[PDB]
Amino acid sequence: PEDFQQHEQIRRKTLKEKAIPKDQRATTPYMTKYERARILGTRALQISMNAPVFVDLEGETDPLRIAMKELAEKKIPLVIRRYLPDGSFEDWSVEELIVD
Amino acid sequence: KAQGRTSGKVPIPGVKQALEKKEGLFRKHMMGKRVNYAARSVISPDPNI
Amino acid sequence: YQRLRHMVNDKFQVRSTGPVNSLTMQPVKGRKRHGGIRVGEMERDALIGHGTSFLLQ
Amino acid sequence: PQNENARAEALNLANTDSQYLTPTSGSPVRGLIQDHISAGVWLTSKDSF
Amino acid sequence: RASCLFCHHFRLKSVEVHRYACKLRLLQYGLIDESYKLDEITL
Amino acid sequence: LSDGRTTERGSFTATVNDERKKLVHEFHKKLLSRGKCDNCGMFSPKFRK
Amino acid sequence: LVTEGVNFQAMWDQEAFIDVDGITSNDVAAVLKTYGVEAARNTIVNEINNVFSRYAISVSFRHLDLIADMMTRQGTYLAFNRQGMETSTSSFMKMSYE
Amino acid sequence: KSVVKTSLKKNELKDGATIKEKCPQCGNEEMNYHTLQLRSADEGATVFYTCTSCGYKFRTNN
Amino acid sequence: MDQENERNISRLWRAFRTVKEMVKDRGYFITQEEVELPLEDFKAKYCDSMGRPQRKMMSFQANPTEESISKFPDMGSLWVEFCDEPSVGVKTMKTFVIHIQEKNFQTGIFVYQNNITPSAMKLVPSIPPATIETFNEAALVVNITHHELVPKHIRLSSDEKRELLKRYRLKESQLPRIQRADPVALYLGLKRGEVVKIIRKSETSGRYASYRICM
Amino acid sequence: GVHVSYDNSIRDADGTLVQFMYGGDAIDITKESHMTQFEFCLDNYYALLKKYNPSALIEHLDVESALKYSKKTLKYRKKHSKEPHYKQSVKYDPVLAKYNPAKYLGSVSENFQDKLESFLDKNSKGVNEKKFRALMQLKYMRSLINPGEAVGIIASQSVGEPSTQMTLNTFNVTLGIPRLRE
Ligand SMILES: [Zn+2]
Ligand SMILES: [Zn+2]
DSSP: OOTTHHHHHHHHHHHHHTEEOTTTOOSOSBOOSSHHHHHHHHHHHHHTTTOOOOSOOOSOOOHHHHHHHHGGGTOOOOEEEEEOTTSOEEEEESTTSBOO | OOOOSSOOSSOOOOSSTTSSSSSSSHHHHTSSOEESSEEEOOOOOOSOO | OOOOSOOSTTTOEEESSOOOOSSSOOOOOOTTTTOOEEOOHHHHHHHHHHTOSSSOO | OOSHHHHHHHHHTSOTTTOSBOTTTSOBOOOOOSHHHHHHHHHSSTTOO | OOEETTTTEESSOHHHHHHHHHHHHHTTTTOSHHHHHHHHSOO | OOSSSOOTTOOOOHHHHHHHHHHHHHHHHHTTSOSSOSSSSOOOOOOOO | OOOSSOOSGGGTTOTTTSOTTSOOOOOHHHHHHHTOHHHHHHHHHHHHHHHHHHTTOOOOHHHHHHHHHHHTTTSSOOOSSTTTSSSOSOHHHHHHHO | OOSSOOOOOSSOOOOOOEEEOOOTTTOOOEEEOOOEEOSOTTSOEEEEOBOSSSOOOOEEOO | OTTHHHHTTHHHHHHHHHHHHHHHHHTEEOOSTTTSOOHHHHHHHTBOTTSSBOSSTTOEEEEEOSHHHHSOSSOOOEEEBOOSOSEEOTTTHHHHHHHHHHHTOSBEEEEESSEEOTTTTTSSSOSSSSOEEEEESGGGSSOGGGSSSSOEEEEOOTTTSHHHHHHTTOOSSOSOEEOSSOHHHHHTTOOTTOOEEEEEEETTTEEEEEEEEEO | OOEEOTTSOEEOTTSOEEESSSTTTTBOTTTTTSSSOHHHHHHTHHHHTTTSOOTTTGGGSBOSTTHHHHHHHHHHHHHSSSSOTTSOOOOSOOSTTTSOTTTBTTOOOTTHHHHHHHHHTTOOOOOOSSTTHHHHHHHHHHTBOOSSOOTTHHHHTTTTTGGGSOOSOOOOOOOHHHHHTO
């Protein structure tokens, strides 16, 4: 009631500190081959649990091959949280990157 | 670190000695954790795969 | 030709699930006891070297 | 392996085809070894008709 | 082996202990140079 | 603390940790070797373990 | 030449025959005693390569740069043991080592 | 002062153990070797090489 | 007859020469040919009539250039100090401290010959504006930065240091360190914190600039 | 835990930093095979261009502001080339230490730069010499290190792996493994 007020004020301001917006972000505009892994895991890990599938899957049982059919059409609704070792981060959607 | 009586064929450990060798706990069952769903066999040639 | 002593008919094994221990809750050794494969020290430090951290988790 | 965050890693990170060059000095480690190498200098020879 | 069993203190000085006391107060933050310049500011 | 250098949680870097082991190890040498006390002249003999 | 036995300062009195800006040791903790740490770094990328080139085995230099900069990361010449890892941040790595 | 010779000269030991190995670095043919046994008896003599003109090696494992 | 009294000057000719390379490579104002003083000219000017040198005439003031004020505004004079006594007494070092007190320099580089009194090595940080750097004549026979392995050492000012901590989003201590009494970091005369940039030859990129901190 | 962070520096995972690129030029070792095979890349421009696909690429990255910068210090390094490297004037920082190679096209290592320049000076060869600069520089851009790379493991498993092959007999000097242990 009063000391969680002195706990969410501190935290979300500290969470507001280390964000780097779309004009200040200067890391790589590529998908760095581990991003392509963990997307194709966790996107396929959602589709196994009856998450909505934004592609016309045509007789595919593997969540992995289904998730590689959404990445080929830039359909995956994930946002990559690229940390920097000070603690800061830059937020990157799947749509604005280039899959090699 | 115990005096004891004699040298009793690598005598009965404390808890520091449960943690200090290649065996013990860290390399033995924290780094070297044995796994489920795993096998081992004898390899063989096959040129049709 | 000389057919040797040691053969592969007492070498291979398979384990999916089974006997945990008490101190560790970890599987058991033993070819006559459903022996568990050991992923060891330089097995730990090659999964890191591939960069994968869900084939290590 | 036992979940789908790992099955993608075994197909994309630590698969064999991406491990074509060694990461030591960039030399290849795959390749045919004994049978086909000495066999291939007969099919590529000029008398193959 | 430094705690004097008679005077209920160390054998050391009041300020010799305080120097290492005050310098570790500076070495628990991201600053090292002020721990050296603390040794400089004396009389 | 007026800067963004350190917070009251502190800062623990190896180079901070390296010099911390230079006060204390030197702090644990002159305490280990004193003739008398300073705020009195009284003292104790050598503890032997 | 090859002088078997290292002394840098008494080789700077004999510059008439010797390019005293080209003498090249392998005592790495003696290079650091005179020539400073970015030179003591430069012996290590060399003298590790003198091992592997002798066996006709090729390693990329980026590994040897990465080791030598890691070994001399403190400004001193530090190694891979209890004493090099005396200064670290994660003690679980210290406990699992030895 | 010994009646037998007790010092090898600087450039006067030319090893004649030289096979015509094709050199992929300068086009040389004559090149020495220094062969050693390394592994157990499932493996032959691992063949080293060393040339004289170019100064770069060569290697055949088995 | 003049066989010991020649390579005792030929070292002191080079010992003088590295100092005016040391003062130049900081960024002070010592000219081109005051570095490149020939041994003939070093014997024609500083040496007296007796066939020997004398080192009071070798002592001088050094001032910053026009550019080592613009980049480092906390810079002043410099009193390069040689000495004639082989055994540096602590009473004669009172003259060294007062002569930095009087003319009010920034730094005074004392240069000794053989040894300094162990009770005289305590007056070295004794002036909190003016710290003292000391060097042997044997520690300066070859300028060490000339060697093919030692890379180009460029110290930085606190406004591109500020952009250095900002570029990689750094702490002020997560850089590779240089030592306190490293001979290169005594050649450049570094106080603590003074980040020096080092451009070395990476074997696969050629020129490559790295950095290092001093604590 | 030494790995390539997203700002291409070599940071131990506790934040502490060792190098500022991966060995200076920060190139993936399993990629730098035809990076300097300049004769080969010329031989196959029409099949290697559409891999390094530039038609859907240029809108996401700086193109020209590092090409001009690379053409300044190269011109500047030719002017100070006979000086010994304690008298070098260092007023031009290299293109690597300012321009991120994964964002700035033409920002490149200043040794491979010297070969890509000096290759085209000795050719009598339908590809123009300006549409070949951008291929070999995009190929440097695509063959960078992918950050979050375990360059700590591979720095060891390029050392501990081939050292299983050198304990044999001498072909004066401490040799092999007991040399390397010191
Ligand atoms: Zn007392
Ligand atoms: Zn050859």
